[PDB]
Amino acid sequence: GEIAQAFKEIAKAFKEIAWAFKEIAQAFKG
Amino acid sequence: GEIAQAFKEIAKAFKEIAWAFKEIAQAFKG
Amino acid sequence: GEIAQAFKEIAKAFKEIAWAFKEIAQAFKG
Amino acid sequence: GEIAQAFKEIAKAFKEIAWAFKEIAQAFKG
Amino acid sequence: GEIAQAFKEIAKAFKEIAWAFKEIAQAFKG
Amino acid sequence: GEIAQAFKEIAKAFKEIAWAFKEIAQAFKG
């Protein structure tokens, strides 16, 4: 289904956003 | 229908947010 | 109905967010 | 329902994070 | 009910991330 | 299913992020 595919893409983007947030936090902490 | 179309547009925006986040994280690495 | 309308409004909100973070990614170039 | 409500709350928080990112990037340039 | 629960937890965390970014932006303004 | 598991993982990652930026925000005060 198109909706199921969109959810998969949204999950993948959330994980990429999470990883970028963690890199930014490391930049401020260091 | 219209619900599937809205989810495709949500997914598109999420992909663009994830890309921007990766760009921002890369700027904090120089 | 209003289920469709809710996801349509979510699509608009995240398009606004995508615009915002594209501008932030550009602002870090300067 | 509950998923749409959570998307809306996430969108509102993203917008506040975007505004703060803008002020931070602007600070780095004067 | 798992996906709705996960979305509620994501929304909770985003509210807290937003609070922190607003504090950080205020620090850069003073 | 799998998509529920993906969002459960995302929830755990963003709670870690909220924790990280709580510390960063309070470090910007002294």
Residue numbers in the entry:
A (entry chain A), B (entry chain B), C (entry chain C), D (entry chain D), E (entry chain E), F (entry chain F): 1 to 30
What do the paper's sentences say?
CCs are quaternary structures comprising two or more α-helices supercoiled around each other with cyclic (Cn) or dihedral (Dn) symmetry. Here, we describe variants with all combinations of the aliphatic residues, Ile, Leu and Val, at a and d to give four classes of peptide: the ββ class, with a and d = Ile or Val; Lβ, a = Leu and d = Ile or Val; βL, a = Ile or Val and d = Leu; and LL, a = d = Leu. Peptides are named systematically appending the one-letter code for the amino acids at the a and d sites to “CC-Type2-“; e.g., CC-Hept becomes CC-Type2-LI. In summary, solution-phase data and X-ray crystal structures demonstrate conclusively that different classes of Type-2 coiled-coil (CC) peptides—i.e., based on abcdefg repeats with predominantly hydrophobic residues at a, d, e and g—adopt a range of distinct states.
Extending the sp2 hybridisation with Leu→Phe mutations gave CC-Type2-FI, which, by X-ray crystallography, formed a 6-helix collapsed structure similar to CC-Type2-LL. Thus, the additional bulk and hydrophobicity of Phe overrides d = Ile and drives collapse of a consolidated core. However, the large Phe residues are accommodated through a half-heptad translation along the superhelical axis between the two helical sheets, resulting in 21 screw symmetry. Despite the complexity of these Phe-containing structures, they are CCs founded on KIH packing. Moreover, the KIH analysis revealed that helices with the same sequence participate in different quaternary arrangements.
